[PDB]
């Protein structure tokens, strides 16, 4: 099958590495504007491809589709599907106390929680 | 190592799939201006990575670093290196007489010679 201009084909989907700063919120709207969603990392195969591109773009971090309503709350993907530490675990980045670290980005080969209104790059996914 | 934003690491190189129309000439100067060069396909492993991308963007063709000086002359890569058909053969799909189909692009999975001032997309490559 085919992907759109500037989107990368891999596996069961097309991905767009958006080198443009936005909140997680804005990054979520952008992907959806394009008929897509924030990157769901389903399994280690898909993590491996993602990590090959995120680790060659170290200067940037990339919001993904993982979040939680609040600090005590479970992580969930965009489709509402539950999170499994089948590919990565979320590294708690919080310096001290915080109720705001409720959105997830990837940097290099690691995944961190960050403040949702923080500026970062992003990855969009669209299933073939 | 690292690639420039909007470029893609694979094997020993960074690649720019450029979704913008240009003659082979302009594609060549656009690549060189980025400190790169039009795609050189060294082998099957590399050809398979490129074709994974070009086959999912079939609405258009991609200029590469292959071209010749006259119709009855050998193909060479930008670095002035010899063409050998270790990875692909150049398909001649030329419907009438022509002294001008002297530049090479990839379209889908296949490689074709074409008139050089023709507008299509391009691929830049930058070795690691
Ligand atoms: Mg996925
Ligand atoms: Mg090469």
Swiss-Prot record, chains A, B:
Residue intervals annotated with topology Extracellular: 1-128
Compartment list: Cell membrane
Alphabetical GO biological process terms: antifungal innate immune response; cell activation; cell surface pattern recognition receptor signaling pathway; cell-cell adhesion; cellular response to molecule of fungal origin; detection of molecule of fungal origin; detection of yeast; inflammatory response
GO molecular-function term, one example from the UniProt record: (1->3)-beta-D-glucan immune receptor activity
Residue positions binding a divalent metal cation: 40, 42, 46, 125
Domain of life where this protein originates: Eukaryota
Effect of gene knockout: Mice were born at the normal Mendelian ratio without obvious anatomical defects but are susceptible to infection with C.albicans. They show impaired myeloid cell activation by fungal particles. Deficient leukocytes display impaired responses to fungi, characterized by reduced inflammatory cell recruitment after fungal infection, resulting in substantially increased fungal burdens and enhanced fungal dissemination.
Positions bound to (1,3-beta-D-glucosyl)n: 29-36, 78
Protein name: C-type lectin domain family 7 member A
Annotated organism of origin: Mus musculus
Parent-record interval covered: 117 to 244 of 244
């Amino acid at each position: 099958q085919s992907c759109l201009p500037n989107w990368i084909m891999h596996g069961k989907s097309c991905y767009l590495f958006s080198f443009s700063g936005n909140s997680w919120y804005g990054s979520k709207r952008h992907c959806s504007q394009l008929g897509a969603h924030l990157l769901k990392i389903d399994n280690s195969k898909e993590f491996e491809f993602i990590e090959s591109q995120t680790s060659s773009h170290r200067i940037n971090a990339f919001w993904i589709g993982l979040s939680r309503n609040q600090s005590e709350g479970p992580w969930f993907w965009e489709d509402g599907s539950a999170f499994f530490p089948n590919s990565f675990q979320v590294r708690n980045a919080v310096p001290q106390e915080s109720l705001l670290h409720n959105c997830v980005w990837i940097h290099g080969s690691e995944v961190y929680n960050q403040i949702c209104n923080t500026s970062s790059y992003s990855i969009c996914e669209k299933e073939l």
